[PDB]
Design a protein around this motif. Structure first.
Motif, PDB file in Angstrom:
ATOM      1  N   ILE A  77      29.352  50.539  34.126  1.00  0.00           N
ATOM      2  CA  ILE A  77      30.664  50.578  33.496  1.00  0.00           C
ATOM      3  C   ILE A  77      31.790  50.570  34.520  1.00  0.00           C
ATOM      4  O   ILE A  77      31.888  51.456  35.365  1.00  0.00           O
ATOM      5  CB  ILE A  77      30.807  51.790  32.560  1.00  0.00           C
ATOM      6  CG1 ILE A  77      29.748  51.730  31.460  1.00  0.00           C
ATOM      7  CG2 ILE A  77      32.199  51.829  31.953  1.00  0.00           C
ATOM      8  CD1 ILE A  77      29.021  53.037  31.236  1.00  0.00           C
ATOM      9  N   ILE A  78      32.638  49.554  34.430  1.00  0.00           N
ATOM     10  CA  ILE A  78      33.712  49.362  35.388  1.00  0.00           C
ATOM     11  C   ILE A  78      35.049  49.249  34.669  1.00  0.00           C
ATOM     12  O   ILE A  78      35.114  48.758  33.528  1.00  0.00           O
ATOM     13  CB  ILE A  78      33.475  48.066  36.172  1.00  0.00           C
ATOM     14  CG1 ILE A  78      32.188  48.173  36.984  1.00  0.00           C
ATOM     15  CG2 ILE A  78      34.642  47.769  37.076  1.00  0.00           C
ATOM     16  CD1 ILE A  78      31.950  46.926  37.814  1.00  0.00           C
ATOM     17  N   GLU A  79      36.122  49.682  35.332  1.00  0.00           N
ATOM     18  CA  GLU A  79      37.435  49.595  34.708  1.00  0.00           C
ATOM     19  C   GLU A  79      37.749  48.143  34.353  1.00  0.00           C
ATOM     20  O   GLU A  79      37.306  47.189  35.022  1.00  0.00           O
ATOM     21  CB  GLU A  79      38.535  50.185  35.600  1.00  0.00           C
ATOM     22  CG  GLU A  79      38.777  49.433  36.889  1.00  0.00           C
ATOM     23  CD  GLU A  79      39.953  50.022  37.661  1.00  0.00           C
ATOM     24  OE1 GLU A  79      39.937  49.998  38.919  1.00  0.00           O
ATOM     25  OE2 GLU A  79      40.907  50.507  36.996  1.00  0.00           O
ATOM     26  N   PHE A  80      38.512  47.996  33.284  1.00  0.00           N
ATOM     27  CA  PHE A  80      38.904  46.700  32.776  1.00  0.00           C
ATOM     28  C   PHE A  80      40.265  46.323  33.372  1.00  0.00           C
ATOM     29  O   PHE A  80      41.222  47.088  33.273  1.00  0.00           O
ATOM     30  CB  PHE A  80      38.976  46.750  31.239  1.00  0.00           C
ATOM     31  CG  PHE A  80      39.406  45.460  30.617  1.00  0.00           C
ATOM     32  CD1 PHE A  80      38.552  44.367  30.601  1.00  0.00           C
ATOM     33  CD2 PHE A  80      40.676  45.321  30.074  1.00  0.00           C
ATOM     34  CE1 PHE A  80      38.945  43.168  30.035  1.00  0.00           C
ATOM     35  CE2 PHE A  80      41.071  44.125  29.503  1.00  0.00           C
ATOM     36  CZ  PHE A  80      40.205  43.041  29.492  1.00  0.00           C
ATOM     37  N   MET A  81      40.332  45.164  34.015  1.00  0.00           N
ATOM     38  CA  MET A  81      41.563  44.683  34.646  1.00  0.00           C
ATOM     39  C   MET A  81      42.174  43.637  33.735  1.00  0.00           C
ATOM     40  O   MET A  81      41.614  42.562  33.573  1.00  0.00           O
ATOM     41  CB  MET A  81      41.267  44.064  36.021  1.00  0.00           C
ATOM     42  CG  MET A  81      40.680  45.057  37.015  1.00  0.00           C
ATOM     43  SD  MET A  81      41.725  46.526  37.220  1.00  0.00           S
ATOM     44  CE  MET A  81      43.139  45.804  38.061  1.00  0.00           C
ATOM     45  N   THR A  82      43.319  43.945  33.133  1.00  0.00           N
ATOM     46  CA  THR A  82      43.799  43.123  32.020  1.00  0.00           C
ATOM     47  C   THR A  82      44.035  41.653  32.359  1.00  0.00           C
ATOM     48  O   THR A  82      43.751  40.775  31.541  1.00  0.00           O
ATOM     49  CB  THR A  82      45.037  43.739  31.288  1.00  0.00           C
ATOM     50  OG1 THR A  82      46.154  43.806  32.175  1.00  0.00           O
ATOM     51  CG2 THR A  82      44.719  45.143  30.778  1.00  0.00           C
ATOM     52  N   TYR A  83      44.523  41.359  33.559  1.00  0.00           N
ATOM     53  CA  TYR A  83      44.872  39.962  33.854  1.00  0.00           C
ATOM     54  C   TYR A  83      43.747  39.126  34.454  1.00  0.00           C
ATOM     55  O   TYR A  83      43.967  37.970  34.817  1.00  0.00           O
ATOM     56  CB  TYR A  83      46.139  39.863  34.716  1.00  0.00           C
ATOM     57  CG  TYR A  83      47.389  40.250  33.965  1.00  0.00           C
ATOM     58  CD1 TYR A  83      47.909  41.527  34.074  1.00  0.00           C
ATOM     59  CD2 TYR A  83      48.032  39.345  33.122  1.00  0.00           C
ATOM     60  CE1 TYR A  83      49.045  41.898  33.380  1.00  0.00           C
ATOM     61  CE2 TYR A  83      49.173  39.705  32.426  1.00  0.00           C
ATOM     62  CZ  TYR A  83      49.677  40.986  32.559  1.00  0.00           C
ATOM     63  OH  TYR A  83      50.812  41.359  31.868  1.00  0.00           O
ATOM     64  N   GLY A  84      42.553  39.697  34.579  1.00  0.00           N
ATOM     65  CA  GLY A  84      41.419  38.913  35.051  1.00  0.00           C
ATOM     66  C   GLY A  84      41.467  38.644  36.558  1.00  0.00           C
ATOM     67  O   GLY A  84      42.031  39.431  37.313  1.00  0.00           O
ATOM     68  N   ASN A  85      40.867  37.549  37.003  1.00  0.00           N
ATOM     69  CA  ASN A  85      40.751  37.298  38.446  1.00  0.00           C
ATOM     70  C   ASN A  85      41.986  36.661  39.090  1.00  0.00           C
ATOM     71  O   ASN A  85      42.679  35.860  38.470  1.00  0.00           O
ATOM     72  CB  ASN A  85      39.477  36.500  38.789  1.00  0.00           C
ATOM     73  CG  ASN A  85      39.607  35.015  38.504  1.00  0.00           C
ATOM     74  OD1 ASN A  85      40.274  34.274  39.241  1.00  0.00           O
ATOM     75  ND2 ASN A  85      38.944  34.564  37.446  1.00  0.00           N
ATOM     76  N   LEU A  86      42.217  37.013  40.349  1.00  0.00           N
ATOM     77  CA  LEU A  86      43.368  36.551  41.122  1.00  0.00           C
ATOM     78  C   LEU A  86      43.499  35.015  41.227  1.00  0.00           C
ATOM     79  O   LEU A  86      44.605  34.457  41.144  1.00  0.00           O
ATOM     80  CB  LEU A  86      43.326  37.197  42.509  1.00  0.00           C
ATOM     81  CG  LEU A  86      44.538  36.947  43.416  1.00  0.00           C
ATOM     82  CD1 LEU A  86      45.835  37.375  42.741  1.00  0.00           C
ATOM     83  CD2 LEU A  86      44.340  37.674  44.794  1.00  0.00           C
ATOM     84  N   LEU A  87      42.374  34.328  41.391  1.00  0.00           N
ATOM     85  CA  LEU A  87      42.392  32.871  41.493  1.00  0.00           C
ATOM     86  C   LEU A  87      43.079  32.238  40.276  1.00  0.00           C
ATOM     87  O   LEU A  87      44.071  31.528  40.427  1.00  0.00           O
ATOM     88  CB  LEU A  87      40.972  32.325  41.689  1.00  0.00           C
ATOM     89  CG  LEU A  87      40.819  30.823  41.979  1.00  0.00           C
ATOM     90  CD1 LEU A  87      41.711  30.390  43.154  1.00  0.00           C
ATOM     91  CD2 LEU A  87      39.345  30.455  42.259  1.00  0.00           C
ATOM     92  N   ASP A  88      42.574  32.539  39.076  1.00  0.00           N
ATOM     93  CA  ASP A  88      43.136  32.031  37.840  1.00  0.00           C
ATOM     94  C   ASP A  88      44.555  32.517  37.631  1.00  0.00           C
ATOM     95  O   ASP A  88      45.406  31.787  37.111  1.00  0.00           O
ATOM     96  CB  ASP A  88      42.285  32.464  36.636  1.00  0.00           C
ATOM     97  CG  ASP A  88      40.930  31.781  36.600  1.00  0.00           C
ATOM     98  OD1 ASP A  88      40.767  30.737  37.272  1.00  0.00           O
ATOM     99  OD2 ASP A  88      40.031  32.286  35.883  1.00  0.00           O
ATOM    100  N   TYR A  89      44.800  33.768  38.007  1.00  0.00           N
ATOM    101  CA  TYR A  89      46.138  34.359  37.893  1.00  0.00           C
ATOM    102  C   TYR A  89      47.162  33.575  38.736  1.00  0.00           C
ATOM    103  O   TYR A  89      48.222  33.182  38.232  1.00  0.00           O
ATOM    104  CB  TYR A  89      46.096  35.822  38.320  1.00  0.00           C
ATOM    105  CG  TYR A  89      47.391  36.598  38.148  1.00  0.00           C
ATOM    106  CD1 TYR A  89      47.769  37.106  36.903  1.00  0.00           C
ATOM    107  CD2 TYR A  89      48.208  36.874  39.244  1.00  0.00           C
ATOM    108  CE1 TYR A  89      48.952  37.838  36.750  1.00  0.00           C
ATOM    109  CE2 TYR A  89      49.386  37.601  39.099  1.00  0.00           C
ATOM    110  CZ  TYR A  89      49.748  38.083  37.843  1.00  0.00           C
ATOM    111  OH  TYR A  89      50.903  38.815  37.710  1.00  0.00           O
ATOM    112  N   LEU A  90      46.839  33.338  40.003  1.00  0.00           N
ATOM    113  CA  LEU A  90      47.686  32.498  40.863  1.00  0.00           C
ATOM    114  C   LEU A  90      47.894  31.088  40.299  1.00  0.00           C
ATOM    115  O   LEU A  90      49.021  30.555  40.308  1.00  0.00           O
ATOM    116  CB  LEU A  90      47.119  32.405  42.279  1.00  0.00           C
ATOM    117  CG  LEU A  90      47.177  33.727  43.061  1.00  0.00           C
ATOM    118  CD1 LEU A  90      46.393  33.660  44.387  1.00  0.00           C
ATOM    119  CD2 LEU A  90      48.614  34.134  43.322  1.00  0.00           C
ATOM    120  N   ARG A  91      46.829  30.477  39.789  1.00  0.00           N
ATOM    121  CA  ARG A  91      46.959  29.122  39.255  1.00  0.00           C
ATOM    122  C   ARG A  91      47.889  29.060  38.054  1.00  0.00           C
ATOM    123  O   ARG A  91      48.662  28.113  37.894  1.00  0.00           O
ATOM    124  CB  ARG A  91      45.588  28.555  38.879  1.00  0.00           C
ATOM    125  CG  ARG A  91      44.770  28.217  40.101  1.00  0.00           C
ATOM    126  CD  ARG A  91      43.411  27.676  39.790  1.00  0.00           C
ATOM    127  NE  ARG A  91      42.729  27.445  41.066  1.00  0.00           N
ATOM    128  CZ  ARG A  91      41.468  27.049  41.203  1.00  0.00           C
ATOM    129  NH1 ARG A  91      40.720  26.826  40.126  1.00  0.00           N
ATOM    130  NH2 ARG A  91      40.962  26.872  42.427  1.00  0.00           N
TER     131      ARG A  91
END
Ligand SMILES: CNC(=O)c1ccccc1Sc1ccc2c(/C=C/c3ccccn3)n[nH]c2c1
Ligand code: NA
Ligand code: NA
Ligand code: NI
Ligand code: NI
Length: 266
Positions: A77-91
């Protein structure tokens, strides 16, 4: 084990990010009304990945919430990061919003996390934009500790025939399968370039098979458009052929903390 919890505490939803992460699921931890990420399931690797996450704690490292290790299926069980991964976020971002100051802020956070790992004598071994996760207000955390290791020496040797993400991997690691904190520094350099380009693929148009030969010849990616010179200089230090000539994460971090503050003043 204080980390052990009841599986029935979690209601399991769909796979995260359309499957890009392997088997990792959105889940609800019912007691706490909390959305979480659940890694399920050789299990040998899987279980150590959990023991590692129990050892490391830092605001820019993705935090372990709990595990069910007692019986299969195994949960992490890991914390949920709302915006997902940095690669897709930057794109996908609005660059007016995620601007030069934000890019500096991201590097500062990541390097902060790596400085902490360095001090603890860990290595990550998978550093890259696809392995960083993004929270509210450009919070960034390093994730995916599956290859993370506590070092007994200054060097770690991957098992024979292990294969790597060539464009992020240090030359000594590609050639000898030797990993160190220095190899992480190299990959961090590639991550900075991913950041500067808002998620371009590195060594554009250059075939994987030719990359190592090029590096031997001291070819390095050019300075991305708009990338401040100090940041390019850091990239280039990260890509030194001799690992002992690469800066420490302590130094890298200090350099970013300085730049980020000076930029905030403006
Ligand atoms: C087995 N694979 C991994 O452990 C892994 C590898 C690279 C990056 C992450 C992970 S684990 C992981 C994956 C997703 C998450 C999220 C949320 C992902 C997300 C959120 C919104 C939209 C798309 N994706 N929060 N915490 C996470 C942890
Ligand atoms: Na690496
Ligand atoms: Na290995
Ligand atoms: Ni700091
Ligand atoms: Ni520091």
């Amino acid at each position: 084990d204080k980390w052990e919890m009841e599986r029935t505490d979690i209601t399991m939803k769909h796979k995260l990010g359309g499957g890009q992460y392997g088997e990792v699921y959105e889940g609800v931890w019912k007691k706490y009304s909390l959305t979480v990420a659940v890694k399920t399931l050789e299990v040998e690797e899987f279980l150590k990945e959990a023991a590692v996450m129990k050892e490391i704690k830092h605001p820019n490292l993705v935090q372990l919430l709990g595990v069910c290790t007692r019986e299969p299926p195994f949960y992490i069980i890991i914390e949920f990061m709302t915006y997902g991964n940095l690669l897709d976020y930057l794109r996908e971002c609005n660059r007016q919003e995620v601007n030069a100051v934000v890019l500096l802020y991201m590097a500062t956070q990541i390097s902060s996390a790596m400085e902490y790992l360095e001090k603890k004598n860990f290595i990550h071994r998978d550093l890259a934009a696809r392995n960083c996760l993004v929270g509210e207000n450009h919070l960034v955390k390093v994730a995916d500790f599956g290859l993370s290791r506590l070092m007994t020496g200054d060097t770690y040797t991957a098992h024979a025939g292990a294969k790597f993400p060539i464009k992020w991997t240090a030359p000594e690691s590609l050639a000898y399968n030797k990993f160190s904190i220095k190899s992480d520094v190299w990959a961090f350099g590639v991550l900075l370039w991913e950041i500067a380009t808002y998620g371009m693929s590195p060594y554009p148009g250059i075939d994987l098979s030719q990359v190592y030969e090029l590096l031997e010849k001291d070819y390095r990616m050019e300075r991305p458009e708009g990338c401040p010179e100090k940041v390019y200089e850091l990239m280039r230090a990260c890509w030194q052929w001799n690992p002992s000539d690469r800066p420490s994460f302590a130094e890298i971090h200090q350099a970013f903390e300085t730049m980020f503050q000076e930029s905030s003043i403006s």
